[PDB]
Design a protein around this ligand. Structure first.
Ligand SMILES: *[C@@H]1O[C@H](CO)[C@@H](O[C@@H]2O[C@H](CO)[C@@H](O[C@@H]3O[C@H](CO)[C@@H](O)[C@H](O)[C@@H]3O)[C@H](O)[C@H]2NC(C)=O)[C@H](O)[C@H]1NC(C)=O
Ligand SMILES: *[C@@H]1O[C@H](CO)[C@@H](O[C@@H]2O[C@H](CO)[C@@H](O[C@@H]3O[C@H](CO)[C@@H](O)[C@H](O)[C@@H]3O)[C@H](O)[C@H]2NC(C)=O)[C@H](O)[C@H]1NC(C)=O
Lengths: 125, 359, 359, 125
């Protein structure tokens, strides 16, 4: 199982980006998926997650109502639609996958076995 | 001459045996820890494979991992049974017989060492019979000879002076009167007669043996005789010498099959054929043709190379960081320790339970 | 009187220590086999629970069984680590020090036994100093005293003559000249002076110690002195006596926590809280309130009684007859033996793999 | 898991019987089910089996075309319809359940963990 994110880069404040994370195998459809972000100088933190079945989604309070996570098992891909970006959203964004089907696993990085390499998102004002 | 103190040709070979017997407890600790350590390595490998199978449920690789886990668990089980049923007694017996014989020898040597009248006259003489010898450092007359049970730390013992054939330095002595006894040194322990030996108002009533029957001290005015012990046979008045030789020769170490990895074909590895037969073929007997066909489905082959390939897959599998510590390695191959890996397996077995409810 | 042979009050307590040291290797084999055997019992219980969980996938009871299997596997792991890191050295060291001291004592006693002039005059006298004693059966003057390393079979050793305080029969002797020495028996080993002792043309140049420093034989015409060893302190010219006492006092046996079953509440049993926290709560810290609530779902309670109830369920579970033999028991509780249960678990883990593909 | 058969008894040659075997728990629907029969003086032998999913059925050659095995997961019950009985069908009939989902497990008694107590079927001529 390997995760590769894409769709990062530079964006102006108030703009939008869609991050993609494709897993290398159909195993994807048995994995809960999450997005974590590590700001410059800060520790890495939860952003969004979606249950293995796609039935439930979870969001950090700082991104609720701006970000949308979704999944497409047919393409082994999880997405993060990020609207209304602000400079404080600048960070390396990591895709991650957990073998747990317990939704409580989704909100903490420590329950995810699989990690992408992370992609830079930089929002300028 | 008869009834004189002993020159170094007599006691030096006893010093050499005593120093080598001192290492038998070291080798016992070495072998017991190595057995336990190898069992732990077998169990770590079984646990790693088991975790791989719990995480990757479904795949052909997971089934290969189940066969791999069974193999190493059996190795770990069989090594523990060998430690209980064979190694424990072997190593206790070698420790006991060697240490007992060493005490028998050491008490005698220590008696010779102390029984002297002067710097030139006594029971324990140098090579030339010029001076009595003294113990300093751990040596007597230049010969390593501590006359004590040194601290026990693991180490493989030498077999220089006690080996498969016997006590290689304790050969027949045809001229003890000139080669063992000095010409002038006074030593009442060299004889049982009363003029120059242990007898007081007459001779001792019988010959006396010392150092667990190694040396025979006659009650007449004749030179001592010694046992030839370099070509031993399972049997005595020198039984502690036979016991220590037999116990040491019987040791196998933690090197029998239970503690060794198997590197030939897959169908012949411990546990494989049986597991394939019952779990996959639902048969009780099989020809290796059917077994190998079944192994191809899961290992993509049936040789050791395909086995190593699955083991490498297991070693690279990551586990959840919260299961090991705030920053520790998370790939199975970088984790070691039975109890640690056990708790990880339990987490994933519990997750497997939960998935089965949902499914 | 000084310089005379030794009456039984002197050597009988040495016989008693030598006979008890003979059992230290027996207790070492006993403890090493018991440790391995208890580890095997812990592992059998883990394997039985694991099989129960593999068969009954889904149910609350299967999750309870996973927690039970983790507990016993950890006990089995920790007992093997204790055997490697603590018990092996303890038991090798007690075997070595006791057997070494026994050889030191036995060589000295055997020398006294043989050094006699007649039936009435010698170094080893009876209680009254009437006759010299002889070894027959395994006794000397009625005292058990084999002067040999007897065959090693497992047995707990007595602590009658060597115990927590020291060598209880080796007390201070205030009147050796009358209580240890005979009045008439001739014994050149009782003195270092030349008239009646070990000296030939003059006295030995120094006092001589024998039996690993227990008895001191002066080079003057005075009675021997002995060490008082009944109230020992960690420290000598009698070091082998200290070493054997310290090694024996340090033994714990296969009775520490790793080898003992836990019978208190469930949340406090080894491995439980951690497994519940991470596998069920997905938290790293918990108050026992949350743990007990989680245990109620799977054990219907949180005390030892609910634990025993799940264990009884595991013991009654049947397995497929083709996995054990053409007629053997098929309930888990009636099966024992690690490798056997291991192969059964593998069969069911393979079946679990197959069900996951289908599901 | 406990199995109880019923519906045995005496029957005249050429008659019919339906044996029933009810399992004590809904676990039934994860079990392959079989019927084994032990004639007087003989060893016990395979009669019929049905896969855990009900998709496949298997019959000893001596009963093919006369016996029919079927299952009803809603009632946790497996049935053996036995037509055209002959004296040689006299036997103790055992219901049995296997946790295996491999159809090759079904044809040999040694792969079945669970056993009923057996019911007498006696066919007189
Ligand atoms: C028998 O063979 C197996 C398979 O090779 C041995 O298990 C393997 O042991 C090694 C070394 O302990 C593990 O890998 C290496 O380990 C270290 C630390 O754990 C790490 O820093 C390296 O990256 C490295 O990969 C290896 O994962 C493990 N293999 C499996 C599949 O578990 C086993 O120890 C051997 N048994 C005995 C008694 O020697
Ligand atoms: C710690 O406690 C556990 C749980 O009681 C022990 O495991 C249990 O051991 C017994 C006895 O070995 C097994 O049951 C009895 O066994 C025999 C033969 O196997 C049988 O003929 C009887 O019918 C009987 O049931 C019992 O199944 C087993 N329990 C489980 C759940 O596995 C364990 O041995 C104890 N550990 C130590 C070191 O004592």
């Amino acid at each position: 199982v390997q995760l590769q994110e894409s769709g990062g880069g530079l964006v102006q404040a108030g703009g939008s980006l869609r991050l993609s994370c494709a897993a290398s195998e159909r195993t994807f459809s048995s994995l809960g998926m999450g997005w974590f972000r590590q700001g410059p100088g800060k520790e890495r933190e939860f952003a969004a997650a979606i249950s293995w079945s796609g039935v439930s989604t979870y969001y950090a309070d700082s991104v609720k109502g701006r970000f949308t996570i979704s999944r497409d098992n047919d393409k082994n891909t999880v997405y993060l639609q990020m609207n209304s970006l602000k400079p404080d959203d600048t960070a390396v964004y990591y895709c991650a996958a957990t073998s747990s089907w317990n939704d409580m696993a989704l909100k903490s990085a420590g329950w995810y076995e699989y990690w992408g390499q992370g992609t830079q998102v930089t929002v300028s004002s | 001459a008869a009834e004189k103190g002993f020159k170094q040709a007599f006691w030096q070979p006893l010093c050499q045996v005593s120093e080598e017997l001192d290492d038998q407890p070291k080798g016992a600790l070495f072998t017991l820890q190595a057995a336990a350590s190898k069992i732990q390595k077998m169990r770590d490998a079984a646990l790693r494979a088991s975790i791989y199978a719990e995480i990757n449920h479904g795949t052909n690789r997971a089934k290969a991992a189940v066969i791999v886990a069974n193999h190493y668990a059996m190795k770990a089980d069989s090594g523990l049974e060998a430690l209980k049923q064979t190694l424990s007694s072997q190593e206790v017996t070698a420790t006991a017989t060697a240490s007992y014989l060493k005490g028998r020898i050491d008490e005698y040597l220590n008696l010779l060492l102390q029984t002297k009248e002067s710097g030139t006259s006594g029971c324990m003489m140098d090579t030339s019979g010029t001076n009595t010898v003294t113990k300093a450092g751990g040596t007597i007359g230049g010969v390593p000879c501590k006359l004590q049970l040194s601290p026990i730390q693991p180490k493989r013992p030498a077999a220089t002076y006690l080996g498969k054939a016997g006590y290689v330095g304790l050969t027949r002595q045809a001229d003890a009167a000139n080669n063992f006894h000095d010409n002038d040194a006074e030593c009442r322990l060299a004889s049982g007669h009363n003029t120059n030996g242990l007898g007081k108002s007459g001779q001792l009533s019988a010959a006396v043996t010392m150092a667990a029957g190694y040396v025979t001290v006659a009650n007449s005015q004749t030179a001592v005789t010694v046992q030839a012990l370099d070509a031993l046979q399972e049997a005595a008045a020198h039984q502690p010498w036979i016991d220590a030789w037999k116990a040491k020769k019987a040791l196998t170490g933690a090197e029998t099959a239970e503690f060794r990895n198997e590197t030939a074909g897959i169908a012949g590895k411990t546990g494989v054929t049986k597991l394939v037969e019952e779990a996959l073929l639902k048969k009780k007997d099989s020809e290796a043709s059917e077994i190998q066909t079944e192994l191809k489905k899961y290992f993509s082959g049936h040789e050791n190379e395909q086995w190593t390939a699955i083991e490498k897959l297991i070693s690279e599998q990551p586990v959840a960081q919260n299961l090991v510590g705030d920053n520790q390695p998370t790939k199975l191959g970088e984790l070691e320790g039975n109890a640690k890996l056990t708790t990880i397996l339990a987490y994933y077995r519990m997750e497997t339970a939960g998935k089965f409810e949902v499914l």
